[PDB]
Amino acid sequence: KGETAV
Amino acid sequence: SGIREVILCKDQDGKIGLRLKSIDNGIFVQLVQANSPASLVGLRFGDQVLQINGENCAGWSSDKAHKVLKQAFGEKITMTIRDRPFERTITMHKDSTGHVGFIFKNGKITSIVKDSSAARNGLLTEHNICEINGQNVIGLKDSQIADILSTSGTVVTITIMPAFIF
Numbered sequence: 001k002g003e004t005a006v
Numbered sequence: 007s008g009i010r011e012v013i014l015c016k017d018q019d020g021k022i023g024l025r026l027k028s029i030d031n032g033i034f035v036q037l038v039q040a041n042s043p044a045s046l047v048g049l050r051f052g053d054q055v056l057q058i059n060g061e062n063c064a065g066w067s068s069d070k071a072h073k074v075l076k077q078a079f080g081e082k083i084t085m086t087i088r089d090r091p092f093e094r095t096i097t098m099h100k101d102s103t104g105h106v107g108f109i110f111k112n113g114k115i116t117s118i119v120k121d122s123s124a125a126r127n128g129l130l131t132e133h134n135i136c137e138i139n140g141q142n143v144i145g146l147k148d149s150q151i152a153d154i155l156s157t158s159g160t161v162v163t164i165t166i167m168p169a170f171i172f
């Protein structure tokens with residue numbers, strides 16, 4: 001995983 | 007205001023399940039293992055340790071703090087804590103696609119999405135996510151953090167702390 005957007 | 011006293015009792019091994027760190031000539035809680043003597047007294051990540059067994063932590067290195075916890079005297083470890091001095095709370099509201107509008111990597115906020123609730127509430131980057139609606143997220147996987155957010159309702163209250171604490 002790299003970047004999680006929420 | 008956020009000052010409290012705690013008494014820690016050492017484990018069967020002789021440990022307390024705590025890691026301390028030196029920041030700005032102060033000592034701060036860096037890690038609290040669950041079901042440990044430190045978790046039992048409500049020690050949280052980012053809490054400042056003012057004194058240990060009648061000695062001020064002021065200007066102690068991480069090395070000295072670590073050594074002091076080992077060379078202690080069993081069932082009696084005394085501490086004065088200042089509750090998370092760098093802690094901040096930010097309330098956000100989900101949009102129609104269920105977003106608060108921020109991006110994070112390893113619990114650390116990296117970007118704020120344009121025209122989101124996080125943008126509106128001035129959420130800052132280079133800040134670690136500590137809690138979502140009072141639930142601790144420190145050291146969970148980013149997916150576990152994401153799944154918790156997705157289930158936190160529309161009103162999302164996050165507790166953050168600048169990256170230099172972690």
Ligand SMILES: O=P(O)(O)O[C@@H]1[C@@H](O)[C@H](O)[C@H](O)[C@H](O)[C@H]1OP(=O)(O)O
Pocket residue numbers: 001002111112113146147148149150
């Ligand atoms: O566990 P840490 O060290 O935080 O590394 C990441 C973690 O930050 C988080 O993104 C997890 O979802 C991921 O699985 C894990 O490994 P990955 O990013 O290599 O998948």
